């Protein structure tokens, strides 16, 4: 067949982009100690083929963690533009989803989803590294449920 093996090929390339995940840990504030605790032994981010840290130009995922102010927004959008396609994003914390306890302040971006798009959301102040892993696995699944080759071969 053709469509069968095309679906299988898409599933395999998704296997790749699902295992070889490299983050840029844009952790501004106290939603960062938890990323570090996660890459720590007891949960071992790397175990899932997910390196502790790495530069953007070779990265795939981008973890936002912390209040997103009006002086560190530009830099963030710059990084998300510099990064190479595909580029997946993960918001990690109240401050970065809805401005958290600083929503009604004057020097906050009330949601990183205004600056940048998003593929996953995570709640907390802070979250628990376990919930963070669960978000990342939701991301792996949001990957595994893609059909690029199918949509092209029926474009």
């Amino acid at each position: 067949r053709a469509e069968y093996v095309v679906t299988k090929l898409d599933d395999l390339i998704n296997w790749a982009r699902r295992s070889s995940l490299w983050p840029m840990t844009f952790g501004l504030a106290c939603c960062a100690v938890e990323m570090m605790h996660m890459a720590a032994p007891r949960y071992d981010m790397d175990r899932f083929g997910v390196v502790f840290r790495a530069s953007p130009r070779q990265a795939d995922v981008m973890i936002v963690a912390g209040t997103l102010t009006n002086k560190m927004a530009p830099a963030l959008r710059k990084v998300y533009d510099q990064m190479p396609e595909p580029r997946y994003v993960v918001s990690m914390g109240s401050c970065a989803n809805g401005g958290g306890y600083y929503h009604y302040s004057y020097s906050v971006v009330r949601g990183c989803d205004r600056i940048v798009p998003v593929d996953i959301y995570v709640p907390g102040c802070p979250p628990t590294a376990e919930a963070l892993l669960y978000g990342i696995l939701q991301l792996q699944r949001k990957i595994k449920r893609e059909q690029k080759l199918k949509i092209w071969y029926r474009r």
Partner: protein
Amino acid sequence: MFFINILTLLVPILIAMAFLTLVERKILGYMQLRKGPNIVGPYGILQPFADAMKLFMKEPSMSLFIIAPTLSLTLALSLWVPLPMPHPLINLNLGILFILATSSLSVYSILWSGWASNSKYSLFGALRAVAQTISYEVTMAIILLSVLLMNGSYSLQTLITTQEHMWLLLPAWPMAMMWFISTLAETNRAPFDLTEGESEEYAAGPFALFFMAEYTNIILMNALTTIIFLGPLYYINLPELYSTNFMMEALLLSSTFLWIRASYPRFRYDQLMHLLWKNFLPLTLALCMWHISLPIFTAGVPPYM
């Protein structure tokens, strides 16, 4: 025949480099008290292929852009040709000098990358790393020029018949303590990996090529040590045994590199160049003079077939 042998020499070494990336991850994890990759496949024997597919999937002067990584990788692969295991693919007198040349060249790639990237930021680190690499390759060459006087020939086969009885470490260990270090600079490994420590232009593909060549050079310098200073057993009926012991000692050195990368901090550039210029070069010259005198105030002046 020959194409078969070149395949046997090129495919397995790429396989080993991949699984060496793996072994690095695993040992670093086990020394930092974590596991490491255990998921993508049984005990993590698929993460490397995963990384390959991912990189080749990532989107991005073409001349430099291509010739630099290609050049580096080709040099790193050719470095393997003249090695004895135990009878080599290409027996070359002056083989180790060919090695040194083809190892020094990659500086051209390092430098073209910078001269292309207009980033002053990039030229900064490029110059720094180029200078350290140069300065350490100097001693990497002098050590051989001071040891090989034990076998009056730049070949790489004579090493074996020499070490038949004894090794080359019980003597010359004032050198092995160096040849096991400069190898950590030409490779830009730790504790001299500042070239990747201070960051403020390698895309996915060319990064894969650079890293391939890096770990290839790792394996190869470790093999060179295992051949020079850790002479294996050449019982002519057991080339298999030779290759086997060589494998063992190469793995041992390649795990020592990782002990190091995990344990130690990094060297500040100035402290590093101080280290070289004011600790290794005087010792190196004096020890070379020592090994020059040894075969004169001792009968041990070797032959040249």
